[PDB]
Design a protein around this ligand. Sequence first.
Ligand SMILES: C=C1C[C@]23C[C@@]1(O)CC[C@H]2[C@@]12C=C[C@H](O)[C@@](C)(C(=O)O1)[C@H]2[C@@H]3C(=O)O
Length: 321
Amino acid sequence: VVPLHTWVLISNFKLSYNILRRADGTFERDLGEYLDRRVPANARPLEGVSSFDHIIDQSVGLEVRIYRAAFLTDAPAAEPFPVIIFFHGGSFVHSSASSTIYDSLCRRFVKLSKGVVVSVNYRRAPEHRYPCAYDDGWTALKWVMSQPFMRSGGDAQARVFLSGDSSGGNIAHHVAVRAADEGVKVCGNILLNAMFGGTERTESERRLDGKYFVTLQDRDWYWKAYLPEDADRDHPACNPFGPNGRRLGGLPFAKSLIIVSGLDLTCDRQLAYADALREDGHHVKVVQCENATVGFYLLPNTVHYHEVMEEISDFLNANLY
Ligand SMILES: C=C1C[C@]23C[C@@]1(O)CC[C@H]2[C@@]12C=C[C@H](O)[C@@](C)(C(=O)O1)[C@H]2[C@@H]3C(=O)O
């Protein structure tokens, strides 16, 4: 089943979020900010990892939190190391790079990768609709590539992985596509329960609706909140290989590690997403965690948690050179 601590943690979010979504498609933003569990950045290492907050684009107030083992001016490292650009989940609406669940996950990523994590505080819906979150991810990719500190190896370049869960996995994808269109090299994408959608329901959507925290009513709400006012769930932001989609054959697209919870009602879409990437000639590794609900990567309390941290470490190591 669901471990008790997972059930209690994810239910606390579910029940809180229930009161923040308004029927008219606006959001209780001030109360949301007040109720979120967050931590500050700290230059003093906790369990060997330090963090730093930094504004990278004044025009939109765009902030990142940088994590490293324990400066942006420093020389490129001789030996390759990964830079993971991370986009938090929260369905385009919730959470922040400072949210404790994501601060914790990024710290674990540093220990795992022996690299640097850059967690992006992208602009959120409904106040900031498509394509703002994608713009912010592109901004963060270009910024990372330009810093001497982020660069490593013989060719002195940033070895970038784009990563995110939920809405953040969606963002990682669109940023990766933009990178491939502009000939910017991304070493890999790491998607955890990447958020995709469509006008029709899939089998998994109908079967799992309401059973493990997530409801179709809330998924529909979040898509409505992020997508343009005149759009529907077949908008390509939402359904990148659907009727209005675009195939990616021929692009220098990143290799992908695609992690999917079997008890996430959108699993069908995630696997069809992976299938499409393969169909287009790109390299994909899918890790299906059959017994896992949304959020499982947030608590170190299941086999799937351990399995996935290991798959992430292997993927990083395999794609660094
Ligand atoms: C309204 C929401 C938003 C959820 C799904 C849910 O239906 C209930 C649980 C939310 C959530 C809470 C915290 C994490 O940010 C998230 C990715 C998750 O695992 O669970 C969050 C997740 C998400 O953003 O996809």
